[PDB]
Design an enzyme around this catalytic site. Structure first.
Site, PDB file in Angstrom:
ATOM      1  N   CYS A 102       0.870  -1.173   0.000  1.00 52.25           N
ATOM      2  CA  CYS A 102       0.000   0.000   0.000  1.00 52.25           C
ATOM      3  C   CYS A 102       0.905   1.221   0.000  1.00 52.25           C
ATOM      4  O   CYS A 102       1.173   1.816   1.053  1.00 52.25           O
ATOM      5  CB  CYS A 102      -0.901  -0.014   1.240  1.00 52.25           C
ATOM      6  SG  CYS A 102      -1.968  -1.488   1.383  1.00 52.25           S
ATOM      7  N   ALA A 103       1.375   1.596  -1.194  1.00 56.14           N
ATOM      8  CA  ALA A 103       2.638   2.330  -1.305  1.00 56.14           C
ATOM      9  C   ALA A 103       2.572   3.859  -1.370  1.00 56.14           C
ATOM     10  O   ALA A 103       3.524   4.538  -0.958  1.00 56.14           O
ATOM     11  CB  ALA A 103       3.464   1.795  -2.491  1.00 56.14           C
ATOM     12  N   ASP A 173       1.551  -1.143   4.912  1.00 56.60           N
ATOM     13  CA  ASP A 173       1.292   0.099   5.632  1.00 56.60           C
ATOM     14  C   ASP A 173      -0.069   0.610   5.150  1.00 56.60           C
ATOM     15  O   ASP A 173      -0.142   1.588   4.412  1.00 56.60           O
ATOM     16  CB  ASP A 173       2.437   1.070   5.282  1.00 56.60           C
ATOM     17  CG  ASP A 173       2.329   2.436   5.970  1.00 56.60           C
ATOM     18  OD1 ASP A 173       1.998   2.526   7.181  1.00 56.60           O
ATOM     19  OD2 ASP A 173       2.634   3.451   5.287  1.00 56.60           O
ATOM     20  N   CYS A 209      -0.761   4.288  11.403  1.00 54.12           N
ATOM     21  CA  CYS A 209      -0.618   5.501  12.205  1.00 54.12           C
ATOM     22  C   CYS A 209      -1.799   5.592  13.162  1.00 54.12           C
ATOM     23  O   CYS A 209      -2.282   6.694  13.469  1.00 54.12           O
ATOM     24  CB  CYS A 209      -0.522   6.764  11.341  1.00 54.12           C
ATOM     25  SG  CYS A 209      -1.832   6.963  10.145  1.00 54.12           S
TER      26      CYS A 209
HETATM   27  C1  LIG Z   1      -1.103   4.850   4.933  1.00 54.93           C
HETATM   28  S1  LIG Z   1      -1.210   5.071   3.136  1.00 54.93           S
HETATM   29  C2  LIG Z   1       0.414   4.445   2.667  1.00 54.93           C
HETATM   30  C3  LIG Z   1       1.525   5.464   2.871  1.00 54.93           C
HETATM   31  C4  LIG Z   1       2.794   5.005   2.172  1.00 54.93           C
HETATM   32  N1  LIG Z   1       3.163   3.615   2.594  1.00 54.93           N
HETATM   33  C5  LIG Z   1       3.923   5.987   2.453  1.00 54.93           C
HETATM   34  O1  LIG Z   1       4.840   5.654   3.204  1.00 54.93           O
HETATM   35  O2  LIG Z   1       3.951   7.123   1.948  1.00 54.93           O
HETATM   36  C6  LIG Z   1      -2.294   3.690   2.691  1.00 54.93           C
HETATM   37  C7  LIG Z   1      -2.494   3.502   1.184  1.00 54.93           C
HETATM   38  O3  LIG Z   1      -3.245   2.319   0.957  1.00 54.93           O
HETATM   39  C8  LIG Z   1      -3.905   2.506  -0.280  1.00 54.93           C
HETATM   40  N2  LIG Z   1      -4.851   1.389  -0.480  1.00 54.93           N
HETATM   41  C9  LIG Z   1      -6.125   1.262   0.038  1.00 54.93           C
HETATM   42  N3  LIG Z   1      -6.628   0.075  -0.388  1.00 54.93           N
HETATM   43  C10 LIG Z   1      -5.698  -0.553  -1.155  1.00 54.93           C
HETATM   44  C11 LIG Z   1      -5.670  -1.768  -1.827  1.00 54.93           C
HETATM   45  N4  LIG Z   1      -6.729  -2.587  -1.808  1.00 54.93           N
HETATM   46  N5  LIG Z   1      -4.537  -2.140  -2.535  1.00 54.93           N
HETATM   47  C12 LIG Z   1      -3.437  -1.304  -2.594  1.00 54.93           C
HETATM   48  N6  LIG Z   1      -3.481  -0.115  -1.929  1.00 54.93           N
HETATM   49  C13 LIG Z   1      -4.573   0.270  -1.213  1.00 54.93           C
HETATM   50  C14 LIG Z   1      -4.484   3.905  -0.132  1.00 54.93           C
HETATM   51  O4  LIG Z   1      -4.877   4.483  -1.365  1.00 54.93           O
HETATM   52  C15 LIG Z   1      -3.305   4.619   0.509  1.00 54.93           C
HETATM   53  O5  LIG Z   1      -2.506   5.268  -0.466  1.00 54.93           O
END
Ligand SMILES: C[S@@+](CC[C@H](N)C(=O)[O-])C[C@H]1O[C@@H](n2cnc3c(N)ncnc32)[C@H](O)[C@@H]1O
Length: 275
Positions: A102-103, A173, A209
């Site tokens: 989840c990047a 994450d 977080c």
């Molecule tokens: C906490 S943020 C990640 C922050 C990132 N790891 C960083 O360090 O900058 C969580 C992310 O999960 C994504 N997300 C939500 N559902 C997802 C899915 N099913 N597959 C991949 N990503 C997903 C969201 O769009 C969001 O960008």
């Protein structure tokens, strides 16, 4: 408020050079902090290295660097103190294959790339187009060349896909709280269980977080109960004194964080390793 944390991007520079640049702008370098009180005491144009986090410089709360020449050059990445934990703890060696599940917008991806020294592969995924666009900007600014970025549902990424057969390391994450709670914890559990099925997985770091046990210790607890004996919690960074809640055996091996205890965002991290 909190001091400003700035990671030195080792893909493009080194701490010695960044320190020298700031010195020439009239900042006073105090070396490495001995304690958080040292960071709490930061004022004027003093700066120092974090007491624990490698490559992490710390400036007084009221300093903006978004417009600084070194920010433009991708020498500095503005990253919350606790946000630096997951890639550091995952510690993939240069040349390895890594999934960032989840990047976006890529702060941890950029950190992974620095640890890899741009050798190997990071398969990164996200569903959000705007955050993915921010991620493209950050990755390029930071000189990351080892990331294959895909707009894809992580749960749709097949563990048996030949592309991921050498992946030994995963950073997970996922989105977290803010009372959207049971659904968020649902995805977190689904995503963690899914990640643990990757055939060659050796170490995974799970982070949020959130301050909520439901998204943190409970998720890890439940995932570990999926295939009992396959994975264990590894004892993370003993010098970091804010630990996981003591809600199950080994939970204290996780880390927690808060503004008051660790001068960071609320945060939680678990280091999970193959037995
Ligand atoms: C906490 S943020 C990640 C922050 C990132 N790891 C960083 O360090 O900058 C969580 C992310 O999960 C994504 N997300 C939500 N559902 C997802 C899915 N099913 N597959 C991949 N990503 C997903 C969201 O769009 C969001 O960008």
């Amino acid at each position: 408020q909190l001091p400003r944390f700035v990671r030195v991007n080792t893909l493009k520079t080194c701490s010695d050079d960044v320190v020298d640049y700031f010195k020439r702008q009239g900042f006073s370098y105090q070396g490495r902090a001995s304690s958080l009180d040292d960071l709490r005491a930061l004022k004027g144009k003093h700066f120092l290295l974090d007491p624990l986090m490698p490559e992490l410089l710390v400036f007084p709360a009221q300093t903006d660097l978004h417009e600084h020449p070194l920010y433009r050059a991708g020498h500095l990445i503005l990253q919350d103190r606790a946000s630096c934990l997951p890639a550091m703890l995952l510690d993939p060696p240069p040349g390895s294959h890594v999934i960032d599940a989840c990047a976006a917008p890529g702060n941890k991806t950029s950190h992974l790339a620095a640890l890899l020294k741009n050798q190997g592969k990071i398969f990164a995924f996200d569903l959000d187009a705007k955050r993915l666009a921010s991620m493209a900007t950050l990755l390029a600014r930071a000189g990351v060349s080892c990331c294959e970025l895909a707009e894809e549902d992580f749960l749709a990424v097949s563990p048996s896909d030949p592309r991921y057969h050498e992946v030994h390391y995963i950073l997970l994450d996922p989105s977290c709280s803010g009372v959207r709670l049971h659904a968020l914890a649902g995805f977190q559990q689904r995503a963690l269980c899914h990640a643990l099925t990757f055939p060659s997985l050796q170490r995974l770091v799970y982070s949020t977080c959130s301050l909520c046990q439901e998204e943190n210790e409970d998720v890890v607890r439940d995932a570990l109960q999926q295939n009992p004996g396959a994975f264990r919690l590894a004892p993370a960074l003993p010098a970091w004194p804010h630990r996981g809640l003591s809600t199950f055996p080994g939970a204290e091996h996780c880390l927690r964080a808060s503004p008051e205890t660790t001068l960071s965002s609320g945060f939680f991290v678990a280091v999970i390793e193959r037995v």
